Symmetry: C3
Subunit: 430 residues, 3 copies
């Protein structure tokens, strides 16, 4: 009786969990021989080919997406005409998202999950500040700046001077900055520039449907990508231990954040115990753990914040609906652990500017992730292509995304709940 | 009395036939010395320079044209709300255009006209399936994917593994696929995405006027291109024999198609003799041979299909006006013989995926060719740039385009006439 | 009392003159040691880095600016429906701007200011005519055509044949030509193509505000650019002599033009003495020298042309407001002396086609310069990037721009004043 009411509703989720559980089985059926006994390199990158085609489609789409959604979502970003009473709420959201992402990078650099087994001088801050502001906007859709060294035989015979050249791989770091600045420009332009907001916001909605079609293709690509990814490692008992250490490190980041950082930020200004606040708001967190979505939590959260932890009733309907779309600390933890776990699963050595352009671009991507159908994974592929990491390891993270999701939902509501607790103590004392 | 009523009406056609007949004369006046006695290579590519400038202008225009006309013509492509009663007519049009193009490629590979006188493994189907879906959309306006080989000294000392890189020459194969998918996306988006259809369909009409100006320049370019093309061959009696074999092979393809393939497709389902149908519709084919245009045939064809070969009168006003713009089998023959005659006039060896991306891109270009002023030749330059063939041989084909046109018009009306004969036998039996 | 009425009004001009006068002081404070005693090349291009960031931002903006302002300003270019009675005025404006620019190039090639201290054959007119009409429009936003030579061992063993390749650096020469032709196309398209004029003219006004923000950043960049530019020369008493010879040559070009060329053009057709005309129009030129702006001159100029040098009263309100925005001979002198002074300040040897694409692109940029905030300097950076000159010397020209501006304003009003004197003698004789 439930063959056309349950399976038809979430057919894509059943299809991708069948494709993952038959992707590990196909990879084990190839690894029973191995990566070189069935067929060698002449057909190794022809068995894994739909798992390359999915990445071709995703890299095709993240060029219109991050430059047409940021223009339409920074031209519709209101200044303090929206209210300076909730601008401290936006500052709190940005600061706690940056602290969440920095805690994720720090914890998955300290615990080091996945690492079980060119020389560039420290002035590559210049190689990032030349990359924020690109030289032109058509040669910043496929290639970025990079400084290489040489010898000129001056002052003796050997000295290392840097020379600059634009090498391949697009810069999403310098194409979200132009998109943000152009969105602020179209907001400042007023009613003369509404045609551009309508054009760039009908172009973003004409790309989300392409994401819908690509995610409908994505079971086949994720099956062959998992199959090609657990064969190339030539080890199955080690990769599941690396995934277990990844889940342990990300759950530890969620627990450490939501039990010691946001309580400390609440205690530093309110100077009342935040655990009484959390004991008031158990049941919205208990249903956010339940349904694993921050949309069905918001009415019950906006209700239950009133009776126990009494607020002024005009900020809890103002910062809470913009606290479940803008403030997402759990997605910041997931992007900043699941993109320094891939950097220790392929040994890319994680230069000190890759930390900055994995931290600020996952702060600037947890505020607009939950509009995309597969939001948290395509917005991880964006920050993987922004630091030139291998995107092919996205399927070992999409395989264990449910264990992380069921405790990732609660941080996104805990953040703006403690923001509602914090912002009421800047108006009860003036 | 007819100096301002006849010459002013078709001045471009008189100008281009004067420029062709003075292009062969100028090429013969240079070949009286030859390609190296007047001036050598220091001024050989300075005498043929306007015939290079015309190709620069055409390659400039086929980037906005095939990506802004396909979006506007696939967003205005109606689904079966247009009618499933004539969706078998569209399937018939696509199948007979593919069969016409395959017959053209097969016949001009078998008879081999024009051939009178890098190693890549058979897995370059991967090099086309990586090219359908490009990696990004700004680096697919000038460069396409291509797999090259090397040696890695593994398993012995010598093995041939493929490595990938994006080499120059744009991919029109993977820029019509994104345009088609984006047009279907803008159709699905409904009334929120009408601004993009108006933008991309005012951008296509603001490029057709550039085609009008370039075709007004085109006499000078075609004169110097013919002059440079019959000098470089260093032979005049052989090139006219190759053009004669080209005209013979394309006329043989038209005759074989319109007398043995579409009759066979009609006989396989209706099982009545199609030559009685053609004996009913002699005179619309006889005036389509006359005026050499499928626009002045359509009222007389839509009339004469009724009285003799009686139809249900609601499909002959429905599939016939969409059978003279969409179904063009003669243009498919002309594109798929005149682009494997250039591949045997310059020895490009015609790899087995170039047959596929000369067959499906001339099936997908005979449905939108007759809106451009010089439609059948610019849409041949498109499929020449899609397979990296030399576009410079377009002027030996535009020189003999009248002998092919006067029997190319009749296939485009014979196709939908037999489609009207076929579709009436899927409703008289239900 | 004047701390919030004078300093708040022109804060950017005070900030940039403080940044220039503290840019020469910082450069002298580094040159007290020199370019290699404080820190060598490992930190020489890290002290001059904001003066590189300003050039990165300017090269980012001149790609949307010159292709979105020319479309919107050539689609709003009226044909002779504006009037053939003032089309000779537009021809006069174009001819005197070309003569002004040619006099500037000739005078700063003859006097040779700043010159105190690859082989390509003369057929690089082909390398410019292949660059006017680019091969495609996405690979003409960052790279242009360039012919290099080789040897093929034919006809002996050594001969020099040219081969072509697209090398880096965008072609603004071939991206204003497509923009002009597209603007004429959108004008011809009529009311079907008003959406594109509104899109490309709301995109140009959404880039002028980015020029406003970049010019607000520009004090820091111009301070560090002046500081890095007077250190690298390793000479301070010579660079100020080169700037003095630059000011002398440009003032000599202004004086020679406005006292011997436009008087000669007036005398060649009217055959009356133009110095009586100038003695009538002393005081509009005397206030144009005063306020240094051609906007506050136009009412007094349009008044004072009537009473003394009597005109037909319908051309002095028609060609004078389009003579203070379109005709700017002083800006043509400044662009065509200040871009062959940089070519003699860095020894780029000034090939005979760089004269043509520094002359016609500064004729085609003095007609739309006075809409940009820093118009005369960004429109100099455009023509410096169009000929691949070093843009880094823009700050030695922006430092002495006031001495040139106060006598550059008077040529832009003298031009259309003598045009009003000229055009009245093609209607008083018919």
């Amino acid at each position: 009786d439930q063959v056309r009411r349950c399976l038809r509703a979430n057919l894509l989720v059943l299809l991708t969990v069948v494709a993952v559980v038959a992707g590990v089985a196909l990879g084990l059926g190839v690894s029973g021989a191995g990566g070189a006994l069935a067929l060698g390199p002449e057909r190794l990158s022809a068995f894994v080919f739909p798992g390359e085609l999915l990445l071709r489609l995703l890299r095709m789409i993240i060029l219109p997406l991050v430059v047409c959604s940021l223009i339409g979502g920074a031209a519709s970003l209101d200044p303090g005409a929206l209210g300076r009473l909730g601008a401290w709420a936006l500052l709190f959201f940005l600061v706690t998202t940056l602290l969440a992402s920095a805690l994720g990078v720090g914890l998955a650099l300290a615990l080091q999950p996945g690492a079980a087994s060119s020389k560039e001088v420290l002035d590559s801050f210049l190689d990032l500040a030349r990359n924020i502001f690109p030289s032109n906007l058509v040669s910043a859709a496929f290639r970025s700046y990079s400084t290489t060294y040489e010898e000129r035989n001056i002052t003796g015979t050997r000295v290392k001077v840097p020379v600059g050249q634009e090498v391949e791989g697009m810069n999403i770091l310098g194409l979200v900055v132009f998109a943000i600045v152009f969105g602020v420009a179209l907001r400042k332009l007023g009613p003369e520039g509404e045609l551009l907001i309508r054009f760039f916001n009908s172009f973003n909605e004409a790309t989300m449907v392409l994401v819908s079609w690509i995610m409908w293709y994505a079971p086949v690509g994720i099956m062959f990508l998992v199959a090609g990814k657990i064969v190339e490692m030539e080890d199955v008992g080690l990769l599941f231990a690396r995934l277990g250490k990844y889940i342990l490190c990300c759950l530890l980041g969620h627990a450490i954040h939501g039990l010691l950082v946001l309580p400390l930020i609440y205690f530093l200004f309110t100077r009342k115990n935040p655990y009484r606040f959390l004991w008031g708001i158990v049941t919205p967190l208990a249903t956010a753990f339940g349904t694993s979505s921050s949309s069905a939590t918001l009415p019950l959260m906006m209700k239950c914040v009133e009776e126990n932890n009494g607020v002024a009733k005009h900020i809890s309907r103002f910062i809470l609906p913009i606290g479940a779309t803008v403030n997402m600390d759990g997605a910041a933890l997931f992007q900043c652990v699941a993109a320094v776990f891939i950097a220790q699963l392929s040994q890319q050595s994680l230069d000190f500017v890759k930390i900055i352009t994995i931290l600020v671009t996952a702060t600037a991507s947890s505020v607009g992730a939950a509009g995309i159908p597969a939001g948290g994974v395509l917005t991880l592929a964006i920050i993987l292509e922004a630091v030139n990491l291998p995107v092919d390891h996205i399927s070992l993270i999409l395989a264990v995304d449910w264990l992380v999701d069921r405790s990732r939902t609660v941080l996104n509501v805990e953040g703006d709940a403690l923001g509602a607790g914090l912002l009421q103590n800047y108006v009860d004392r003036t």
